[PDB]
């Protein structure tokens, strides 16, 4: 599969950092998955660090390798989309073979299909990473001019990221309001508060705090993971 | 119309019986059975509100491939509507008159839906078929008659007019048979309904059960056009035919059929009756003296206003669309609720059951109406107080798209003669072969030639008598 050329990576960096466009808009504009757009920015930010700290880039290695790989040029020539930004994950429940008996003239929609798989399952209309594309396509059906349809799409994505950025802000705040930082002569003691009564009806709760009693060491079991599983 | 829009438009009104209609569902067959045998399955608002939602719903299905309508008892399929109840409401001021206008609003929405139905529709005329029963059938591609069938339109007898789509079917029947059946309110029985053209097939009442169990087996392909589907059902109905009567002859044929074309070709009921007197006169070369005298004794009893209005719609309906027809009739029917003849004819004949003597129309007879009088235009003028009839769909047409499954008529025989150069006997075999041995083709085609065909070229060939 092709790779984002060096020029394309820079274009993505300007639209998200300089022009301030939302990531969902740059994703839908260049057909680049939001997970890749967020990566191109992190990797570019690391280059600015090297260029600022006067570190030599592996330019000989970069050029020689990029010639070996197929590339897409975001901009003038829109030959093909870089990748499909609407790939939905196949949920286990949606994989079952169900033939539901219904009346001979029922309008069985995706909402009805989601409930036929489970009570908590959602239709693919809600499992998209850029769900604003549906509301954008519905505008075209209503003979809405393209220039106006694009306006509502930006305001829709720009407004969705505001809620996401607002949730994360309030989240991190609650994580700090629960920590009492007491500075001593040597270290800084962080007293995190929790509800010691949330241990489940039988004391076996996955999220309970404390070294559980009545369990020996699993250090002699096969397939026992003893290396870090998360570098945060 | 959406599913909820229909369920909300046909809410069960107070007084509706829960089982006026019985609905059955088989493999490919959906059945509608009128279930008021004590009243001869007479239509009413209660049962019209049960049929319309189903027909709209079965139309959204791909597994309902044949729709069959029929009656419950062995005596009647559908014997008119609840006109007796309409005469009472009309006597309760304008508030009661609109209730009647709303009834015809429902009845016409159903007939239009049947006429423009997008699935094969069959009607078992296994009993008397009058009034409302005619509207549920005539607009269908398949209309099966039996020895029990009795067709008639006794609307002019009660000071009314052929109401249910009759302004579209009768005007475009072969010859002047339309106006004759509508004005005189003639009564056809058995195979005569099949020779006239009201029915497309003729079976025996005992063969209908076996026919249904076969129609249910017919599983069409989704990609078959409506034409192919109607061809499969037409060939299936012709398998259960046990033959027409061996001795019963075409009633409206030959001399009588020729007289109808000469007497019912004018645009004034005064001239029509004048022509009938010539036939009834002694020495008339027509030879239908007995028939002409009988029809005269009938017209004198029919409402004189209904004759003018009826004869007027037969001449106008010939150029109307089917959708435009039900809308105009809804306006016409509204004027009859206000008129005096309708309320008198119904109250005198049906509510009184013939007691208190015969009816008393607004004019005592047709002689009271002077020549220059015009008592028809008043009924053909829309009333702004009566909202236009909103049909269940926007489909329409100027002529039935599929109405050539019956016997060949003057139109079919004419086209074959003006197109080809057949002979007397060769032409008859052209239809007996084209229809694949349909019972009655030889007798029908033979009759059409006896009237509208002469040896213009000698024994070599035959052409029309007109020119």
């Amino acid at each position: 599969q092709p790779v984002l050329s060096e020029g394309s990576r820079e274009i993505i960096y300007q639209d998200v950092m300089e022009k301030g466009l939302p990531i969902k808009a740059v994703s839908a504009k260049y057909n680049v998955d939001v997970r890749r757009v967020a990566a191109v920015i992190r990797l570019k930010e690391i280059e600015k660090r090297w260029i600022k700290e006067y570190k030599p880039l592996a330019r000989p290695y970069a050029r020689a390798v990029m010639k070996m790989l197929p590339q897409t040029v975001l901009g003038g020539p829109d030959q093909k989309p870089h990748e499909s930004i609407n790939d939905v994950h196949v949920h286990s429940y949606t994989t079952q073979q169900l033939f539901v008996p219904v009346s001979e003239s029922r309008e069985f929609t995706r909402e009805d299909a989601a409930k036929a798989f489970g009570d908590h399952i959602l239709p693919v209309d809600k499992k998209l990473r850029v769900p604003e594309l549906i509301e954008f396509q519905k505008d075209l059906l209503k003979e809405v001019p393209l220039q106006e349809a694009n306006r509502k799409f930006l305001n829709a994505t720009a407004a969705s990221e505001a809620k996401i950025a607002e949730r994360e802000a309030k989240r991190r705040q609650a994580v700090e309001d629960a920590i009492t930082r007491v500075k001593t002569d040597r270290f800084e003691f962080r007293f995190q508060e929790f509800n010691a009564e949330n241990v489940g009806h039988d004391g076996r709760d996955r999220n309970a705090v404390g070294w559980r009693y009545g369990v020996p060491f699993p250090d002699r079991k096969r397939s026992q993971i003893k290396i870090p599983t998360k570098v945060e | 119309i959406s599913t909820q829009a229909a369920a909300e438009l046909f809410k069960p009104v107070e007084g509706d019986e829960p089982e006026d209609v019985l609905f059955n569902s088989l493999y490919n067959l959906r059945s509608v059975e009128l279930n008021r045998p004590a009243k001869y399955n007479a239509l009413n608002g209660s049962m019209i509100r049960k049929i319309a939602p189903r027909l709209l719903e079965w139309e959204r299905s791909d597994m309902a491939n044949v729709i069959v309508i029929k009656g419950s008892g062995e005596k009647a399929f559908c014997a008119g509507g609840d006109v007796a109840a309409l005469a009472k409401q009309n006597a309760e001021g304008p508030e009661g008159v609109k209730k009647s206008v709303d009834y015809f609003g429902l009845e016409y929405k159903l007939n239009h839906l049947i006429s423009t139905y997008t699935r094969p529709y069959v009607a078992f005329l296994d009993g008397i078929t009058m009034g409302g029963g005619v509207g549920l059938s005539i607009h269908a591609p398949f209309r099966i008659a039996t020895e029990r069938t009795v067709f008639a339109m006794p609307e002019t007898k009660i000071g009314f007019f052929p109401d249910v789509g009759a302004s579209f079917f009768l005007p475009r029947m072969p010859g002047q048979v339309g106006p004759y059946l509508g004005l005189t309110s003639a009564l056809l029985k058995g195979v005569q309904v099949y020779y006239a053209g009201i029915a497309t097939h003729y079976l025996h009442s005992s063969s209908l059960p076996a026919l249904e169990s076969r129609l249910a087996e017919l599983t069409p392909r989704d990609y078959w056009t409506i034409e192919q589907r109607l061809s499969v059902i037409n060939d299936t109905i012709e398998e259960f035919s046990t033959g027409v009567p061996y001795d019963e002859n075409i009633e409206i044929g030959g001399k009588i059929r020729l007289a109808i074309d000469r007497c019912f070709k004018y645009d004034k009921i005064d001239e029509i009756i004048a022509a009938l007197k010539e036939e009834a006169a002694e020495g008339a070369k027509g030879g239908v003296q007995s028939w002409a005298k009988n029809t005269l004794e009938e017209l004198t009893q029919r409402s004189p206003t209904s004759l003018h209005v009826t004869l007027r719609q037969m001449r106008l309906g010939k150029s109307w669309g089917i959708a435009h027809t039900f809308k105009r009739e809804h306006q016409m029917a509204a004027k009859f609720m206000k008129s005096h003849d309708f309320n008198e004819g119904v109250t005198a004949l049906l509510i009184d059951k013939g007691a208190n003597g015969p009816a008393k129309w607004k004019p005592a007879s047709l002689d009271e109406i002077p020549p220059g009088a015009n008592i028809s235009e008043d009924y053909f003028r829309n009333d702004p107080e009566v909202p236009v009839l909103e049909l269940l769909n926007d489909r329409s047409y100027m002529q039935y798209p599929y109405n050539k499954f019956g016997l060949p008529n003057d139109y079919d025989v004419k086209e074959a003669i003006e197109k080809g150069n057949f002979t007397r006997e060769k032409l008859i075999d052209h239809f007996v072969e084209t229809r694949r041995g349909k019972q009655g083709v030889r007798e029908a085609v033979s009759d059409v030639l006896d009237r509208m065909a002469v040896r213009s070229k000698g024994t070599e060939h035959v052409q029309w008598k007109k020119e």
Binding site: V90, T109, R110, E111, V124, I134, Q137 | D62, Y223
Partner: protein, 75 residues
């Protein structure tokens, strides 16, 4: 695995047409009849890119692609 959903399809259809007929949609004439008719039947409504198999068998060794040493070799 994943499936591609075109927003243009989900905006115009709610999936009802996929349950027409007897539950699996309308039937199309066999292949030996389509080309016989000079007129090709209208394109059947469906999400673009359907009726193509997914190579599940080729993902037997996917868990190995998550190790750090392997990811370095794939980069």
């Amino acid at each position: 695995a994943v499936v591609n959903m075109d927003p243009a399809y989900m905006a115009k259809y709610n999936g009802s047409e996929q349950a027409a007929g007897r539950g699996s949609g309308l039937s199309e004439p066999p292949a030996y009849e389509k080309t016989a008719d000079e007129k090709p039947a209208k394109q059947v409504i469906a999400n673009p890119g359907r009726k193509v198999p997914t190579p599940y068998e080729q993902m037997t060794f996917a868990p190995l692609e998550r190790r750090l040493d392997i990811a370095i070799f794939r980069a």
